[PDB]
Nucleic acid binder design. Structure first.
Ligand SMILES: NC[C@@H]1O[C@H](O[C@H]2[C@@H](O)[C@H](O[C@@H]3[C@@H](O)[C@H](N)C[C@H](N)[C@H]3O[C@H]3O[C@H](CO)[C@@H](O)[C@H](O)[C@H]3N)O[C@@H]2CO)[C@H](N)[C@@H](O)[C@@H]1O
Ligand SMILES: [Mg+2]
Ligand SMILES: [Mg+2]
Ligand SMILES: [Mg+2]
Ligand SMILES: [Mg+2]
Ligand SMILES: [Mg+2]
Ligand SMILES: [Mg+2]
Ligand SMILES: [Mg+2]
Ligand SMILES: [Mg+2]
Ligand SMILES: [Mg+2]
Ligand SMILES: [Mg+2]
Ligand SMILES: [Mg+2]
Ligand SMILES: [Mg+2]
Ligand SMILES: [Mg+2]
Ligand SMILES: [Mg+2]
Ligand SMILES: [Mg+2]
Ligand SMILES: [Mg+2]
Ligand SMILES: [Mg+2]
Ligand SMILES: [Mg+2]
Ligand SMILES: [Mg+2]
Ligand SMILES: [Mg+2]
Ligand SMILES: [Mg+2]
Ligand SMILES: [Mg+2]
Ligand SMILES: [Mg+2]
Ligand SMILES: [Mg+2]
Ligand SMILES: [Mg+2]
Ligand SMILES: [Mg+2]
Ligand SMILES: [Mg+2]
Ligand SMILES: [Mg+2]
Ligand SMILES: [Mg+2]
Ligand SMILES: [Mg+2]
Ligand SMILES: [Mg+2]
Ligand SMILES: [Mg+2]
Ligand SMILES: [Mg+2]
Ligand SMILES: [Mg+2]
Ligand SMILES: [Mg+2]
Ligand SMILES: [Mg+2]
Ligand SMILES: [Mg+2]
Ligand SMILES: [Mg+2]
Ligand SMILES: [Mg+2]
Ligand SMILES: [Mg+2]
Ligand SMILES: [Mg+2]
Ligand SMILES: [Mg+2]
Ligand SMILES: [Mg+2]
Ligand SMILES: [Mg+2]
Ligand SMILES: [Mg+2]
Ligand SMILES: [Mg+2]
Ligand SMILES: [Mg+2]
Ligand SMILES: [Mg+2]
Ligand SMILES: [Mg+2]
Ligand SMILES: [Mg+2]
Ligand SMILES: [Mg+2]
Ligand SMILES: [Mg+2]
Ligand SMILES: [Mg+2]
Ligand SMILES: [Mg+2]
Ligand SMILES: [Mg+2]
Ligand SMILES: [Mg+2]
Ligand SMILES: [Mg+2]
Ligand SMILES: [Mg+2]
Ligand SMILES: [Mg+2]
Ligand SMILES: [Mg+2]
Ligand SMILES: [Mg+2]
Ligand SMILES: [Mg+2]
Ligand SMILES: [Mg+2]
Ligand SMILES: [Mg+2]
Ligand SMILES: [Mg+2]
Ligand SMILES: [Mg+2]
Ligand SMILES: [Mg+2]
Ligand SMILES: [Mg+2]
Ligand SMILES: [Mg+2]
Ligand SMILES: [Mg+2]
Ligand SMILES: [Mg+2]
Ligand SMILES: [Mg+2]
Ligand SMILES: [Mg+2]
Ligand SMILES: [Mg+2]
Ligand SMILES: [Mg+2]
Ligand SMILES: [Mg+2]
Ligand SMILES: [Mg+2]
Ligand SMILES: [Mg+2]
Ligand SMILES: [Mg+2]
Ligand SMILES: [Mg+2]
Ligand SMILES: [Mg+2]
Ligand SMILES: [Mg+2]
Ligand SMILES: [Mg+2]
Ligand SMILES: [Mg+2]
Ligand SMILES: [Mg+2]
Ligand SMILES: [Mg+2]
Ligand SMILES: [Mg+2]
Ligand SMILES: [Mg+2]
Ligand SMILES: [Mg+2]
Ligand SMILES: [Mg+2]
Ligand SMILES: [Mg+2]
Ligand SMILES: [Mg+2]
Ligand SMILES: [Mg+2]
Ligand SMILES: [Mg+2]
Ligand SMILES: [Mg+2]
Ligand SMILES: [Mg+2]
Ligand SMILES: [Mg+2]
Ligand SMILES: [Mg+2]
Ligand SMILES: [Mg+2]
Ligand SMILES: [Mg+2]
Ligand SMILES: [Mg+2]
Ligand SMILES: [Mg+2]
Ligand SMILES: [Mg+2]
Ligand SMILES: [Mg+2]
Ligand SMILES: [Mg+2]
Ligand SMILES: [Mg+2]
Ligand SMILES: [Mg+2]
Ligand SMILES: [Mg+2]
Ligand SMILES: [Mg+2]
Ligand SMILES: [Mg+2]
Ligand SMILES: [Mg+2]
Ligand SMILES: [Mg+2]
Ligand SMILES: [Mg+2]
Ligand SMILES: [Mg+2]
Ligand SMILES: [Mg+2]
Ligand SMILES: [Mg+2]
Ligand SMILES: [Mg+2]
Ligand SMILES: [Mg+2]
Lengths: 124, 138
RNA sequence: CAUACC
RNA sequence: AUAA
RNA sequence: GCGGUGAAUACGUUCCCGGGCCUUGUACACACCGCCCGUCACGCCAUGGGAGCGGGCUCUACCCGAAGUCGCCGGGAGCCUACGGGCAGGCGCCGAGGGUAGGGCCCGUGACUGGGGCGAAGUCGUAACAAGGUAGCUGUACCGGAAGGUGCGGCUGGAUCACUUUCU
RNA sequence: UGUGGACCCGCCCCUUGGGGUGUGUCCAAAGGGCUUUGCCCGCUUCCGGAUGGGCCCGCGUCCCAUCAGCUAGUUGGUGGGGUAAUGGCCCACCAAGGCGACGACGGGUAGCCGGUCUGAGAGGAUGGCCGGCCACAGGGGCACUGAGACACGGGCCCCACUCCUACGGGAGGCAGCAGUUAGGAAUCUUCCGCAAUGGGCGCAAGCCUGACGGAGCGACGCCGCUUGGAGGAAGAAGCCCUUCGGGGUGUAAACUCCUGAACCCGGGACGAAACCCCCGACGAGGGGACUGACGGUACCGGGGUAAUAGCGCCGGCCAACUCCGUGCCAGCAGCCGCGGUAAUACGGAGGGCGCGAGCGUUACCCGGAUUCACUGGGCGUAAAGGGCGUGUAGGCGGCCUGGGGCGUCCCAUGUGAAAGACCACGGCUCAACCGUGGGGGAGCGUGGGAUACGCUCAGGCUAGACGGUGGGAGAGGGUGGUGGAAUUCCCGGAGUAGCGGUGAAAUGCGCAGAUACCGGGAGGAACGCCGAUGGCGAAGGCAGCCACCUGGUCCACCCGUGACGCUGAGGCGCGAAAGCGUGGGGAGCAAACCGGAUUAGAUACCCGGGUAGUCCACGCCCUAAACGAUGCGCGCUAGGUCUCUGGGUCUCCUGGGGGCCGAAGCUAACGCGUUAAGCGCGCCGCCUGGGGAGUACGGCCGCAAGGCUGAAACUCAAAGGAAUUGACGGGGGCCCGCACAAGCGGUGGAGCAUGU
């Protein structure tokens, strides 16, 4: 635009809306499972995907994903969610922390251990 | 109407050179003329002169180019590679002496208008003033 | 090729 | 019908 | 594989099937057995309207009004006095807040209800893309399970021109 | 008592209530200690200093205009009250003012700053440690006492909450240090000491300081440091791979020697010299004594053990590949994407890469993002030119001269605290950390100067703009009038068996005589040829002919005015079609509708009917593919050719307008190219990935239908433009083939053979 116009109006700065209202800003948020489900992916994917509907201390009902091959979450399990969209299930934006609260660490896992949250296999 | 008569000239010149005219006519003003004085001095033109078209006063500028060149396209190098208005109406640009720009590491000039009169970049800095930055030429 | 329904 |  | 006997017909290129070259249009590229549209069914999600309930903030008028300063009185109507005056007390303005009436705004909740967006392989047709087989798109108006159709006018971002002929 | 000060009135200087001066009036005090006639500490009044404050002003300080009007102590006056002091701070009376698009009023959000993070910078984000200011002390008011408070550990009252209660009544206030509990993803010891520094009172000795100096917990952060160092096979074992030869882990290990974190013993701090006391004088100066929380710590000396390694990753981006398991499952995934039986992408293993007392994850800020572009973007077709005008504010403005000096530039000077940031030299063994010094600094204040450009004032000019005179072309607009062709209907004539319509038909019309044909009439609507390669208009749009009314325009003369100019948020007007209201009209056409066909169906295309509507007047509506999908103005930059309309010396020259081709140049390309999409300047409008959505909400407008303005949640990795090569078309053109056609013999039926 003309300068007189920038003078008159000006450039409007950009607002950047969150990808993840885990309120507080906070890194994570605790909630309870109010159902464990299986979900079908989309696009060129097929499998049965473990999710939970969680009701949060944020006072928010969001659907989290339950990573790992084995999971132990039930229709009253308390859990810690943590943000991280699952690319295939639309509307699944947060992940669940494996190793915190009711959620068990993955079992007999030896590689990417601290995600999945499993201790250190012990011997000599 | 003619809103900026300086840009008109600056441009009039830019236009003429890109088709390699021998000379071009700008309608005349002392201030326009006081610029051509510098263009001329610093080697960008061959000089100018007050001609007179249809009984109204013009400044004929005499343009200056390179030598003919090699390969396809023999059109010569331009002397005024580049020439552009800095300060304009509704955006006047003024600079302190500590802010007069080094154009192309001095390979080009920057005419500016001070209370000691119209002057090159080197001229004002080595003379201690600042003013309205008119235009870069390189 | 591997699948899905009538 | 669906995926390559 | 081999010899013996030994024909008919071909005007023509309009139709049917394939193929070559040039050109045009294209939303096709696993290339028309392509692409694609909308209703509908199943499922997940956020959301508009909403009678009525619960809560907060504010404004206008009227009324009650603590504390406290300030003002008036301070009286044979209490205390002190050097008679000048002080104090106690009393009234009044203001005044936190409260209440009655009307209005404006903000959040929760909610019977009922409208559409939305997503989710390999459910249903109906086939609107669009090739002149998409009635050029398309468009403002508006009416009509129809659905894409849509028709009127009127506009645009070219239409191939250029001889009964309907869906899907892959 | 009156040094002196305060108050009224007068006078001088000053210029706001500052400083003198005269009369009048008013106003002072406190004692205490001794080494006891002199010192120490106090008290009183006045003047000055220092330090700390109050108040006022210029400029700067987030988002929403889907918040455009706001204000009654409101705005000013006079006189009062009040205060340390100005002031509608408060009060009475008087005037009717004050503020707002330069964003008032309302709403939303927020303590502000030095600084901090990021960034090449401009910018963006932030205000956590520390320092400055402000505000608050359960919530709301209020004053008292004081130099100072409207007072966190002071007072009163109202409210809410906990506690005591003999039922009337009382008591509390951690957002001081610790600590408990609650909420949360999450945040410390109910520690030590007044030794240092600082504060309060005291003459002092001292006392009081949860200020503070220290220790404690937490890898939370930075910095430093260790888990060893040199030798050691042509290369153990195990695990891995293999072309069955081998190759890998790998000098790694074992093992040889060497230092010696941990740990033990001994010495053991700096921080602390003042206050006090003595000589001198209670001064300067000299002498003396006391004091350590941290802490038996830091540090120094001797003794001395081979003595923690994790986490992430290895499809591309992005350093690092091989087996097994799995089979669109189980799973991965920041984006693109991996997995459907040979997965370097999933799970394990060997190996490898990267960091390492850490390594990853999630969250948030800047960056890359010139992706809000001032630096540093765009709008013909990708998102974006307002439907068009007229014009308000505002922005911008030709040539010459003079004044001023607002902008602009320059010199000097004041301010820019410390911390932090930059550089040097230093202190802890280094660093982290800290000390000393230097350097820079935006911005504002003052004094002096410059005057080109911008501004303003005063003159001047004619080249921009307008005017005058003469001449022109036009479907430009409004009103009245009028012309012929056709369709339809009505009357008459003649004439008889159909007409119509389609791919084929039917519905339909026709013996009450239609269709065709002739003559007469009524009407409604639209104007053939001329006619486009045309013209006019700002756009929408405008075409029979005549007249009147009226708008724009172009040329010649170079006559007049003298910068009067451009653009233009709001406003106001105009605005195809459809649609609406009130009357009128109604030939033809025709949404809806009623029928006939077609079809698998056919709520369609085809056919026969047909209402609104199409027409008029008046009033609304305000939209569009309202398109050149290209805002208006001006200047500049080869030419050729066709055309419309002026002028001139009329083979041609010179204007205005409409096309085509093309120089330079531009463009992603297509294209544009003196009718720019080139080169430039002024101004307006608009864009910021797709969907949700031109939706919801709010406002405004409308009789309505709706229009204008116009989001968010949620959701995707695309959506797009141009071109390229194909393939394709129920697109074109050209052309073949027993492809059809022209022929002659077959199969399909029968019985059987053979294959399925
Ligand atoms: N998101 C689609 C929106 O709704 C419509 O599309 C929606 C429906 O029409 C459509 O339905 C299609 C159907 O057309 C088609 N013939 C069959 C198909 N299985 C369906 O698909 C749907 O349903 C199945 C389960 O039944 C889901 O697994 C699948 O994800 C979903 N797309 O599925 C869509 C919802 O995902 C509009 N056409 C479209 O324009 C609009 O964008
Ligand atoms: Mg993430
Ligand atoms: Mg992984
Ligand atoms: Mg063919
Ligand atoms: Mg050939
Ligand atoms: Mg071809
Ligand atoms: Mg070819
Ligand atoms: Mg081709
Ligand atoms: Mg098809
Ligand atoms: Mg609601
Ligand atoms: Mg209420
Ligand atoms: Mg009262
Ligand atoms: Mg009272
Ligand atoms: Mg009283
Ligand atoms: Mg009240
Ligand atoms: Mg179709
Ligand atoms: Mg088809
Ligand atoms: Mg089409
Ligand atoms: Mg309807
Ligand atoms: Mg449509
Ligand atoms: Mg219809
Ligand atoms: Mg049409
Ligand atoms: Mg006296
Ligand atoms: Mg006196
Ligand atoms: Mg005076
Ligand atoms: Mg006096
Ligand atoms: Mg006295
Ligand atoms: Mg005494
Ligand atoms: Mg002072
Ligand atoms: Mg008043
Ligand atoms: Mg006063
Ligand atoms: Mg007053
Ligand atoms: Mg405001
Ligand atoms: Mg605050
Ligand atoms: Mg800042
Ligand atoms: Mg940048
Ligand atoms: Mg803090
Ligand atoms: Mg702070
Ligand atoms: Mg509290
Ligand atoms: Mg307290
Ligand atoms: Mg808790
Ligand atoms: Mg102390
Ligand atoms: Mg002390
Ligand atoms: Mg070694
Ligand atoms: Mg030793
Ligand atoms: Mg040894
Ligand atoms: Mg002491
Ligand atoms: Mg002595
Ligand atoms: Mg001494
Ligand atoms: Mg060892
Ligand atoms: Mg690599
Ligand atoms: Mg193998
Ligand atoms: Mg499985
Ligand atoms: Mg495998
Ligand atoms: Mg594979
Ligand atoms: Mg692998
Ligand atoms: Mg990977
Ligand atoms: Mg960078
Ligand atoms: Mg940026
Ligand atoms: Mg852009
Ligand atoms: Mg388009
Ligand atoms: Mg566009
Ligand atoms: Mg336009
Ligand atoms: Mg409009
Ligand atoms: Mg438009
Ligand atoms: Mg205008
Ligand atoms: Mg103006
Ligand atoms: Mg001006
Ligand atoms: Mg000027
Ligand atoms: Mg001047
Ligand atoms: Mg000045
Ligand atoms: Mg500083
Ligand atoms: Mg910096
Ligand atoms: Mg050092
Ligand atoms: Mg320093
Ligand atoms: Mg200054
Ligand atoms: Mg100055
Ligand atoms: Mg001067
Ligand atoms: Mg003048
Ligand atoms: Mg005239
Ligand atoms: Mg006309
Ligand atoms: Mg008749
Ligand atoms: Mg007869
Ligand atoms: Mg009949
Ligand atoms: Mg008969
Ligand atoms: Mg007839
Ligand atoms: Mg007749
Ligand atoms: Mg009639
Ligand atoms: Mg034309
Ligand atoms: Mg035109
Ligand atoms: Mg048109
Ligand atoms: Mg006229
Ligand atoms: Mg003249
Ligand atoms: Mg004159
Ligand atoms: Mg209209
Ligand atoms: Mg109409
Ligand atoms: Mg009507
Ligand atoms: Mg009628
Ligand atoms: Mg009809
Ligand atoms: Mg019909
Ligand atoms: Mg009607
Ligand atoms: Mg009308
Ligand atoms: Mg002629
Ligand atoms: Mg022309
Ligand atoms: Mg070119
Ligand atoms: Mg090109
Ligand atoms: Mg061209
Ligand atoms: Mg131009
Ligand atoms: Mg362009
Ligand atoms: Mg727009
Ligand atoms: Mg969008
Ligand atoms: Mg969007
Ligand atoms: Mg609309
Ligand atoms: Mg609305
Ligand atoms: Mg209404
Ligand atoms: Mg394309
Ligand atoms: Mg073809
Ligand atoms: Mg044949
Ligand atoms: Mg047989």
């Amino acid at each position: 635009p003309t300068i007189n116009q920038l003078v008159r109006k000006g450039r409007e700065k950009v607002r950047k809306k969150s990808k993840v209202p885990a309120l507080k800003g906070a890194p994570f948020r605790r909630g309870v499972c109010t159902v464990v489900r299986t979900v079908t992916p989309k696009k060129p994917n097929s499998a049965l995907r473990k999710v939970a509907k969680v009701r949060l201390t944020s006072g928010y009902e969001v659907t989290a994903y339950i990573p790992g091959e084995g999971h132990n979450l039930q229709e009253h399990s308390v859990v810690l969610i943590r943000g991280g969209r699952v690319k295939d299930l639309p509307g699944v934006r947060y992940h669940i922390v494996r190793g915190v609260y009711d959620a068990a660490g993955v079992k007999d896992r030896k590689k990417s251990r601290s995600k999945y949250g499993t201790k250190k296999p012990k011997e000599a | 109407m003619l809103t900026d008569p300086i840009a008109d000239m600056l441009t009039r010149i830019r236009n003429a050179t890109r088709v390699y005219k021998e000379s071009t006519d700008v309608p005349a003003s002392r201030f326009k003329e006081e610029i051509l004085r510098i263009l001329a001095r610093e080697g960008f033109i061959k000089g100018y002169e007050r001609v007179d078209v249809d009984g109204k006063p013009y400044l004929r500028v005499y343009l200056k180019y390179g030598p003919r060149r090699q390969g396809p396209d023999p059109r010569p190098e331009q002397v005024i590679h580049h020439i552009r208005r800095i300060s304009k109406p509704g955006r006047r640009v003024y600079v302190g002496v500590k802010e007069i720009p080094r154009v192309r590491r001095g390979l080009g000039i920057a005419i500016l208008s001070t209370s000691k009169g119209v002057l090159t970049d080197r001229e004002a800095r080595k003379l201690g003033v600042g003013g309205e930055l008119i235009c870069e030429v390189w």
